């Protein structure tokens, strides 16, 4: 998930 | 150690003032010229949580984060953060959950409501 969002 | 300082002893970058994200220059960079809007950005990046465990780093992973700039693709404060950076800068942003990942947070290791220290450094911009 991280980094993206 | 560094989140302490940078909480108490950085600079709010955000537009509202409201100290969501502080930041500290660590190493300044080239000249006067930070990223515009759509840049490509190369980032080297390391992600402390307020526990002290470190859930992401990309130079463990031997390569640059690429994103487009000021696009949502990245936490508000990385957005927001960068965009205040020359190229070869490091500086540490400390970000509350209303720039990062809020009462989500993010599967597997950010936890709702948290608060996340960066240390990011700005390897290149490029216009598209």
Redesign the interface.
Known sequence: ?5 | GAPATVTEQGEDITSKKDRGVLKIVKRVGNGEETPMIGDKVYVHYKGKLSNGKKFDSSHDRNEPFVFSLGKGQVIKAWDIGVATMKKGEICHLLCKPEYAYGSAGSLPKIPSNATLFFEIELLDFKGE
């Open positions: 998930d991280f980094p993206f969002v």
